[PDB]
């Protein structure tokens, strides 16, 4: 990689390779994700993102996660980073949705992590929708996690007086 003359393309070929991952082995996959993250100057991105979303669908599937779960968390990390740099998009919204589906803490933690972050980040607009989304999600749901969720959000508050 310390061929820091680091050509565009090469980074790009990864996905192809990556496709192969669907024949799992997380551990390998995991190595990939880290590896993967790196190349992206917040670009070859979309095609990827899309692909990620594909992954995401794929991730849904019917699953009996045991290994891939892990991956997900990781992915999200990997993913997280990018965003920091980037301006990101709808894809993201989808996580929010996605997250609603889900049922385990670690994600909530991420989410929360996001809570924090976003709290810092504020360009805002999205949030509001999402807040709406959430409103649904929320209405649509119960749990400690949620319960907790409410608290912060509540804490947060703005309009629709």
């Amino acid at each position: 990689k310390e061929h820091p003359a680091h050509e565009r393309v090469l980074q790009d070929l990864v996905m192809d390779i990556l496709r192969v991952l669907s024949t799992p082995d997380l551990e390998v996959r995991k190595k990939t994700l880290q590896l993967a993250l790196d190349l992206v100057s917040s670009r070859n991105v979309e095609e990827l993102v899309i692909v990620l979303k594909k992954e995401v669908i794929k991730t849904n599937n019917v699953s009996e996660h045991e290994d891939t779960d892990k991956y997900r968390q990781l992915l999200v990390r990997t993913l997280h980073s990018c965003s920091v740099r980037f301006p990101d998009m709808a894809a993201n919204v989808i996580p929010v949705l996605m997250e609603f589906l889900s049922d385990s803490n670690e994600a909530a933690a991420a989410d929360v992590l996001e809570f924090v972050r976003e709290a810092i980040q504020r360009f805002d607009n999205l949030r509001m929708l999402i807040v709406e989304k959430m409103l649904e999600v929320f209405h649509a749901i119960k749990s400690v996690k949620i319960y907790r969720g409410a608290l912060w959000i509540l804490g947060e508050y703005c309009s629709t007086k």
Binding site: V112, F115, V116, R148, G155
Partner: protein, 112 residues
Amino acid sequence: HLCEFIEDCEFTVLATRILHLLGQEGPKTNNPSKYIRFIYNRVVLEHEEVRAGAVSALAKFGAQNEEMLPSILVLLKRCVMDDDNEVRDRATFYLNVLEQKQKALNAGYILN
């Protein structure tokens, strides 16, 4: 004995009860450093909740102050402070609450 043992004799539930009681008692029985010493410990435990009691008990206490407390009482809330969002909030809020009344007044209303 209670303090120590309970610490390493566990059960959160006990703590609730005792907390509540202790909550009232404070500086009428002095021994501040120790008592502080304890109090810190009680909090030490995780649980936003476990942590929380030491502050609440404190309100009757703080207000009264003891063999050294008012100046310092003021200093302490500052020295000990926390994030963890709603745990953050608890610190912030108590503060914020604190922020909101002349602390002398503050003590009077809340206490009752």
